[PDB]
Amino acid sequence: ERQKVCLDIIYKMMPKLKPVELRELLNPVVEFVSHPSTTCREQMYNILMWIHDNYRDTDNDSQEIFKLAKDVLIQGLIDENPGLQLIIRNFWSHETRLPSNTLDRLLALNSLYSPKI
């Protein structure tokens, strides 16, 4: 319950924050991947897509935050919950996340990789 309410707080508050604070804020947030609750993982994923869409566009630290966000998102591609798998597939299959052109989609996903996945 604390995890859920804290993540809801983060979801309602991030646009007010700045990348300098967001760095240190997110540094422990990503720890809750593989947490024993699909709810918290889903909420932090919502955080992650919010950041990624708001940071896929420049300051070096913001670039580092956005890189960490995309990295953990790639780590989030593997889900024990099939619903999380479906929602992450819906997210990544989107045009902004993946170019509609098959050639361009292939070129984009080349960068997408994790040694864990």
Side-chain angles (χ1 to χ4, degrees), residues 14-15 17 19 22 46-53 55-58 62-63 65-66 69 73 91 96-97:
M14 73 290 290
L17 207 43
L22 286 167
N46 311 134
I47 304 292
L48 290 175
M49 51 214 77
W50 194 105
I51 295 299
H52 173 80
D53 302 329
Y55 276 77
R56 54 196 309 159
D57 47 352
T58 311
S62 54
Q63 289 152 203
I65 304 150
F66 155 65
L73 271 169
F91 164 85
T96 307
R97 294 82 168 150

Side-chain angles (χ1 to χ4, degrees), residues 17-18 20 34 49 71 98 102 105 107:
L17 207 43
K18 273 70 64 180
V20 288
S34 71
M49 51 214 77
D71 291 332
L98 265 187
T102 78
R105 212 181 205 80
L107 296 180

Side-chain angles (χ1 to χ4, degrees), residues 28-53 55-88 90-92 94-100:
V29 167
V30 310
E31 294 177 353
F32 303 124
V33 69
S34 71
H35 169 274
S37 87
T38 73
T39 74
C40 318
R41 291 171 261 155
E42 191 275 333
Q43 290 158 288
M44 67 204 288
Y45 298 159
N46 311 134
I47 304 292
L48 290 175
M49 51 214 77
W50 194 105
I51 295 299
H52 173 80
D53 302 329
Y55 276 77
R56 54 196 309 159
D57 47 352
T58 311
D59 172 70
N60 54 0
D61 296 330
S62 54
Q63 289 152 203
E64 299 158 351
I65 304 150
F66 155 65
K67 281 187 293 282
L68 162 68
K70 77 164 69 66
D71 291 332
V72 64
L73 271 169
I74 297 301
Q75 308 327 116
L77 290 172
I78 292 190
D79 313 283
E80 57 87 19
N81 174 26
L84 291 173
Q85 294 276 130
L86 169 66
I87 194 49
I88 200 152
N90 304 342
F91 164 85
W92 283 103
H94 183 253
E95 196 286 308
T96 307
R97 294 82 168 150
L98 265 187
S100 296

